[PDB]
Design a protein around this motif. Sequence first.
Motif, PDB file in Angstrom:
ATOM      1  N   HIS A 152       0.727  -1.062   0.256  1.00 47.45           N
ATOM      2  CA  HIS A 152       0.062   0.618  -0.261  1.00 47.45           C
ATOM      3  C   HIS A 152       0.759   1.238  -0.094  1.00 47.45           C
ATOM      4  O   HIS A 152       1.685   1.672   1.126  1.00 47.45           O
ATOM      5  N   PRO A 153       0.197   2.055  -1.135  1.00 48.97           N
ATOM      6  CA  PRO A 153       1.347   3.620  -0.846  1.00 48.97           C
ATOM      7  C   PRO A 153       0.141   4.398   0.030  1.00 48.97           C
ATOM      8  O   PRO A 153      -0.422   4.036   0.596  1.00 48.97           O
ATOM      9  N   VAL A 154       0.318   4.924  -0.267  1.00 49.01           N
ATOM     10  CA  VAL A 154      -0.747   6.423   0.506  1.00 49.01           C
ATOM     11  C   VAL A 154      -2.306   6.678  -0.019  1.00 49.01           C
ATOM     12  O   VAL A 154      -3.292   6.907  -0.015  1.00 49.01           O
ATOM     13  N   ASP A 155      -2.093   6.400  -1.763  1.00 46.66           N
ATOM     14  CA  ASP A 155      -2.912   6.320  -2.727  1.00 46.66           C
ATOM     15  C   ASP A 155      -4.157   5.634  -2.483  1.00 46.66           C
ATOM     16  O   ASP A 155      -5.403   6.571  -1.921  1.00 46.66           O
ATOM     17  N   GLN A 156      -4.055   4.499  -1.603  1.00 43.76           N
ATOM     18  CA  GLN A 156      -5.433   3.628  -1.783  1.00 43.76           C
ATOM     19  C   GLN A 156      -5.791   4.309  -0.367  1.00 43.76           C
ATOM     20  O   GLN A 156      -8.026   4.108  -0.193  1.00 43.76           O
ATOM     21  N   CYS A 157      -4.941   4.450   1.307  1.00 38.30           N
ATOM     22  CA  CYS A 157      -5.768   4.863   1.934  1.00 38.30           C
ATOM     23  C   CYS A 157      -6.365   6.627   1.660  1.00 38.30           C
ATOM     24  O   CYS A 157      -7.001   6.487   2.092  1.00 38.30           O
ATOM     25  N   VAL A 158      -6.211   7.455   1.057  1.00 36.77           N
ATOM     26  CA  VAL A 158      -6.451   8.710   0.727  1.00 36.77           C
ATOM     27  C   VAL A 158      -8.142   8.542  -0.608  1.00 36.77           C
ATOM     28  O   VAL A 158      -9.102   8.729  -0.355  1.00 36.77           O
ATOM     29  N   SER A 159      -7.589   6.993  -1.746  1.00 39.82           N
ATOM     30  CA  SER A 159      -8.752   6.934  -2.103  1.00 39.82           C
ATOM     31  C   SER A 159     -10.089   5.960  -0.662  1.00 39.82           C
ATOM     32  O   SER A 159     -11.828   6.442  -1.407  1.00 39.82           O
ATOM     33  N   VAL A 160      -9.513   5.541   0.266  1.00 42.15           N
ATOM     34  CA  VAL A 160     -10.971   4.774   1.040  1.00 42.15           C
ATOM     35  C   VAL A 160     -10.774   5.831   1.957  1.00 42.15           C
ATOM     36  O   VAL A 160     -12.053   6.246   2.145  1.00 42.15           O
ATOM     37  N   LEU A 161      -9.995   7.208   2.498  1.00 45.25           N
ATOM     38  CA  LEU A 161     -10.787   7.799   3.127  1.00 45.25           C
ATOM     39  C   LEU A 161     -11.727   8.652   2.054  1.00 45.25           C
ATOM     40  O   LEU A 161     -13.433   9.240   2.681  1.00 45.25           O
ATOM     41  N   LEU A 162     -12.063   9.168   1.119  1.00 43.95           N
ATOM     42  CA  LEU A 162     -13.200  10.064   0.105  1.00 43.95           C
ATOM     43  C   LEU A 162     -13.763   9.102  -0.274  1.00 43.95           C
ATOM     44  O   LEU A 162     -15.052   9.187  -0.173  1.00 43.95           O
ATOM     45  N   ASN A 163     -13.673   7.661  -0.318  1.00 44.47           N
ATOM     46  CA  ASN A 163     -15.147   6.870  -0.537  1.00 44.47           C
ATOM     47  C   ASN A 163     -15.546   7.083   1.032  1.00 44.47           C
ATOM     48  O   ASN A 163     -16.836   6.827   0.837  1.00 44.47           O
ATOM     49  N   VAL A 164     -14.924   6.732   1.991  1.00 38.48           N
ATOM     50  CA  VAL A 164     -16.278   6.784   3.390  1.00 38.48           C
ATOM     51  C   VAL A 164     -16.520   7.930   3.387  1.00 38.48           C
ATOM     52  O   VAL A 164     -17.655   8.203   4.248  1.00 38.48           O
ATOM     53  N   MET A 165     -15.557   9.594   2.770  1.00 37.58           N
ATOM     54  CA  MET A 165     -16.239  10.424   3.261  1.00 37.58           C
ATOM     55  C   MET A 165     -17.526  11.190   2.448  1.00 37.58           C
ATOM     56  O   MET A 165     -18.713  11.027   2.740  1.00 37.58           O
ATOM     57  N   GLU A 166     -17.476  10.220   1.169  1.00 36.27           N
ATOM     58  CA  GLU A 166     -19.433  10.640   0.336  1.00 36.27           C
ATOM     59  C   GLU A 166     -19.936   9.752   1.166  1.00 36.27           C
ATOM     60  O   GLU A 166     -21.542  10.098   0.970  1.00 36.27           O
ATOM     61  N   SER A 167     -19.310   8.459   1.821  1.00 38.74           N
ATOM     62  CA  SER A 167     -20.634   7.623   2.024  1.00 38.74           C
ATOM     63  C   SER A 167     -20.965   8.555   3.883  1.00 38.74           C
ATOM     64  O   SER A 167     -22.223   7.763   3.915  1.00 38.74           O
TER      65      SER A 167
END
Lengths: 525, 102, 322, 17, 51
Positions: free
Chosen positions: C240-255
């Motif tokens: 994992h880089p930070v990129d999947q972390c920010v992707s999961v963060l934007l997923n949980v922020m939009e939900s």
Amino acid sequence: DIAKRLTAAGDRKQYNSIIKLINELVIPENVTQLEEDETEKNLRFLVMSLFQIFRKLFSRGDLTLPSSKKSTLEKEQFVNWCRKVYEAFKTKLLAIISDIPFETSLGLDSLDVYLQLAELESTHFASEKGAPFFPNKTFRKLIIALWSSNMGEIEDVKSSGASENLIIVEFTEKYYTKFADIQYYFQSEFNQLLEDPAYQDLLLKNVGKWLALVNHDKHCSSVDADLEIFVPNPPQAIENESKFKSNFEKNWLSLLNGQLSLQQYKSILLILHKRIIPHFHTPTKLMDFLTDSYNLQSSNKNAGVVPILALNGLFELMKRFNLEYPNFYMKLYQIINPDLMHVKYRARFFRLMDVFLSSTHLSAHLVASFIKKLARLTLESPPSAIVTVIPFIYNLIRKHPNCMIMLHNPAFISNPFQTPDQVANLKTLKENYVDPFDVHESDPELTHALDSSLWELASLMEHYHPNVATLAKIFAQPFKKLSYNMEDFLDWNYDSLLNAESSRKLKTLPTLEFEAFTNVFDNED
Amino acid sequence: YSLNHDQPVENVIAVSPTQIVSCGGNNFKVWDLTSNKKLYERGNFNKAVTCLDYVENFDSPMQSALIASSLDGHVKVFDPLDNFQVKFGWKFSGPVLSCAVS
Amino acid sequence: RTHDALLDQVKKLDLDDHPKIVKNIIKAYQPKLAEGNKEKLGKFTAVLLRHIIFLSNQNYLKNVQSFKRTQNALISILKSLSEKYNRELSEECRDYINEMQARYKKNHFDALSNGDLVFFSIIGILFSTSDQYHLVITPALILMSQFLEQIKFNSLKRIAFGAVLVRIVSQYQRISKRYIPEVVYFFQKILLTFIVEPLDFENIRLDSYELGLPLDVDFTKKRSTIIPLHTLSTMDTEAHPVDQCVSVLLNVMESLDATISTVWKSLPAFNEIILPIQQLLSAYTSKYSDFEKPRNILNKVEKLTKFTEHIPLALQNHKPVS
Amino acid sequence: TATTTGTVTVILSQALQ
Amino acid sequence: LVSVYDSYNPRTILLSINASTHPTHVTKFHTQDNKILATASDDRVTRLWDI
């Protein structure tokens, strides 16, 4: 091997032997040396267990007939040789119990039974023309081997429990529990062993073996279910009930002095009131211990569960001797927190707050704070805590009916028989309303929770679980119920929740959706 | 007017026509009533003082006596003439909820 | 026809396209000449459910689009055949609930195979959970809540598992609008997990309080989404880089934004749910000044709290009995 | 954590208060 | 329900003042006057009653 062992056994039990007795007696040192060399080097022989059992039977016959009982004339080498062979067999058994890499199930688990049966038959077979049961030297050596017998990591099991040493677990199964005198003499030899300096610097270390030895509700001082005896003549051991309790007290406090780890800290805190506190002559000695456990304010993140565990012993200690912890309801108000609903111990605390909040000398503002904070905590919570919070709020509102202004404020009711000026004033005040409840207040009486209202239960009325939502409907229902049997509502879990859900009363048939989610199934397909 | 005993009071009795004594919490306080003002406070207990009562002119070395009962076993007698100092006490076998004298 | 391994032994020959064809061939074998075909019928319904269960997460780095079309076609044919058959499939779903609970009973997290996500998704397809009680979707809902706050979120594999569990529960409540209190704690946990790196907000007691995303985010606008690729996420959360972390963060922020607009407006304690989420999102927007979605969420929840009423309760106004 | 003994000083303190 | 009997006769309840619906926790007559009785209750209001 097995051939020489069985031949030497037949020769030792045949009629008599002198030089063959010397050979089959010095052969036990060779058997001990072979087991000590193959220790973590063979680990599957069973000839070692056969040699231990055969030397046990041989020394048992030798202690039956030719023991070191007494002497009359010129038998001044036979008694010394027989007691030398018996003492070497006992020392080999003690080394066999002390030296084991892991749960090898033979070299310690049979040496323990060997030394136990040896001392159990050596209660008699001495000069003792009375009613002794004197194993004391052999027993002190047994327990110092039992505490030096450190295995790999089964001592201090870092999840929970006490110690997973297999022979110590077998000891507290059947060599500690099922009688009266040997546990008492164990406590006496323990509280002689904890006083010479080298043994006490080793004995304050492996405390988990003792926790596994004690936490069983089956002591001779506990009058719930009592035991029988296996020893021939017990020498006033069961008589001095004061000596057993005083020994239990002093070794409890003296090894509670030493190297507290957090797991066994929580273990003794959990067993502090139902297991050990009746077996203290003066239980006020533990009062400093559990009051500092109660106001434990540590930087460790799991050091917030220990006040909740110190509460039971501390409240039983206060109730039995009315001592005072100052600012009690302030500390009990700060002990409720979002950790307390996600914690493992909820029912153990709430069945104590049942007693703490049923007091007839506390205030409506205090109960208002205790239920408004509990509701703001319960809006983000498992149903395990929902179904024990909302009947608790029911019983507290039922016992302090001034707290029903948090559920029903009559100033915010629009009846059809109102002045136009009245409905004007109603609109202006419900626009100029703001609730005064402040979660950061430490004082329950100074929290403005009576002046606030209680929205969290009304929000909780729409819950995903039907049983939970129909339980929260009672705050829109009237209050004809008197109480709710909190100990019947307390310990509903996720596991038992879906257990009863799969094993519910009736069984409807499932239905299907006319929605046709063909391509987009979720928003994630 | 209003007298701010800080703890929730459990009892208020009147000693003089002027001074009254309120118990609540671990102490009791006395209040001059013509001047709206506290003038003694004794906190010689462990738990909350539940009740008070007062005696006058009875056959005693003490010309007045205020006794106080305090949820920890203790009932104590305080002498209002030397600054409400405690003079005697009884310990009982549980938390004492109310007390009185003849 | 099939008895939970007979379909495996029969159609364990081709890769993806022939599997749906062999399923349709077994369906044409049974229901056409069905003069007594009920037990074989309900059996191979259960076998098709269990078959997508032991198919959904094996090896998806072979032909992904062929997997996608054959599982989509498999779910279409499953729903279309099981419209007439609920009373044999729902028993098997109940036993699957009862056995994955026993999986979770022993294993701490790693008995949660990633076919359980699509199991929850497909029962959310074949029934709408509008209703209060239902025989199979309420044990699924308490299981999904049990996994939302009974497993320890320190791996981003677990965090993505929780993100799609919130996805499934919001698609559950899209029509029933109930209040799951546990998704509030899940949002509270992970939205401060990504900026804990602890001296500002006390009581969430996170599990992985050292990880989180740094102060040098690239501010790229083409970042990814949900990624319905749990087989790929299992590799991604170890390489994992930070990129999947920010992707999961934007997923949980939009939900989170979606569940605010859809559910929490209809709760009287909304102004009591959105104090700590507002706190940590204020911490976001004054830690980065980069993501515009915390300012968007701040502005819309400020509008909701300012333009609702939030007056006290009058729950005990009862009509008088005669 | 404690490392001193199990003492009796809360008892003594609210004996002397 | 404040109930005042006469002392040394438990069978003649003299009058039953129906005070607040809340529990009435303290009832005492005036110490100067004879015909007024002060009752405070869990209603956060005391009452002086002429008997």
